[PDB]
Design a protein around this ligand. Structure first.
Ligand SMILES: Nc1ncnc2c1ncn2[C@@H]1O[C@H](CSCC[C@H](N)C(=O)O)[C@@H](O)[C@H]1O
Length: 285
């Protein structure tokens, strides 16, 4: 058994302290909704901590089916946070999202022109952007990242969460810029996934971008390979929890930052609660 003792999990890309030469997917049902729910609950909890969530309109682009979004919506709604949800996708959403006055579902694939009309329509509310659009090829990726930057420039949000996976070095097309932000690592991501989420909060009227080159691509690939191949396969023996696999240890850390109405005697009790709550909601054993 791959046993180990760990202080804390790697929460952001930058934390990974090792790499592996990438060698050329899921153990749980609804694992994808889980992966998404944890990251977005983590992101939104942070904004709440900063006082920038209440009264904002959450514009989620590439939100369908969005089964897990119902849970996120209920969570903040039950906490008393006032948020309007605007879920836009060309595909249809899970019907559990229907019939809620605080959530507007839009069946539209967004283009730059559309962003301008919704910006005019959302005005003067403050916007929190969440993007999970998916076309893939390096060209498909770049195009998605290009669109995500136009979302921020037009919508001009107070914070953003963007889907982010660096293209493979051996499939490099050109250097590009992505918004400056924290590269949040995702527990329960596919076995060999190199995807993370870019979380940014916008101050003043500036927009800081960062260039990404092929050498960065090589680094992303090796660090993400060691994390997937070695780290995620660890059994944290010093983690006193029903499940000691690395992903549960990693999940505990994101869930411990979440706010609940119900008071708990220990962080462990809360996490156990939120997790039970989350798994029951997702119908995961
Ligand atoms: N330009 C665009 N505007 C809106 N949605 C887009 C888009 N291009 C692709 N998409 C959508 O992006 C989605 C990627 S899968 C998204 C899953 C969703 N976040 C969930 O929680 O279940 C697809 O549903 C696709 O239709």
């Amino acid at each position: 058994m791959d046993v180990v003792s760990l202080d804390k999990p790697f929460m952001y890309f930058e934390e990974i302290d090792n790499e592996l030469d990438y060698e050329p997917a899921k153990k749980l049902p609804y694992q994808g909704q889980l992966k998404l729910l944890l990251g977005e609950l983590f992101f939104l909890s942070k904004l709440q901590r900063h006082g920038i969530l209440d009264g904002a309109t959450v514009v989620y682009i590439g939100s369908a089916p969005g089964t897990h979004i119902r849970y996120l919506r209920d969570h903040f709604y039950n906490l008393g946070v006032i948020i309007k949800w605007m879920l836009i996708d060309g595909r249809h959403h899970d019907p559990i999202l229907n019939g809620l006055r605080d959530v507007t579902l839009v069946t539209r694939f967004v283009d730059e022109e559309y962003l301008r009309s919704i910006k005019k329509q959302l005005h003067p509310s403050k916007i929190i952007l969440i993007s999970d659009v998916r076309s893939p090829s390096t060209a498909d990726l770049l195009s998605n990242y290009a669109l995500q930057n136009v979302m921020i420039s037009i919508l001009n949000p107070v914070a953003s969460s963007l889907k982010w996976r660096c293209p493979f070095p051996d499939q490099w097309i050109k250097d590009f810029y992505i918004p400056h932000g924290n590269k949040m690592l995702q527990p329960f991501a596919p076995s060999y996934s190199a995807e993370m989420r870019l979380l940014s909060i916008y101050t003043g009227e500036n927009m800081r971008l960062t260039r990404v080159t092929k050498s960065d691509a090589v680094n992303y690939a090796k660090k993400m390979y060691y994390l997937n191949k070695i780290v995620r396969n660890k059994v944290v023996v010093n983690f006193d929890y029903p499940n000691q696999e690395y992903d549960y240890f990693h999940m505990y850390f994101m869930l411990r930052t979440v706010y609940c109405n119900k008071t708990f005697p220990t962080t462990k009790a809360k996490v156990l609660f939120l997790q039970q709550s989350i798994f029951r909601f997702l119908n995961i054993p």
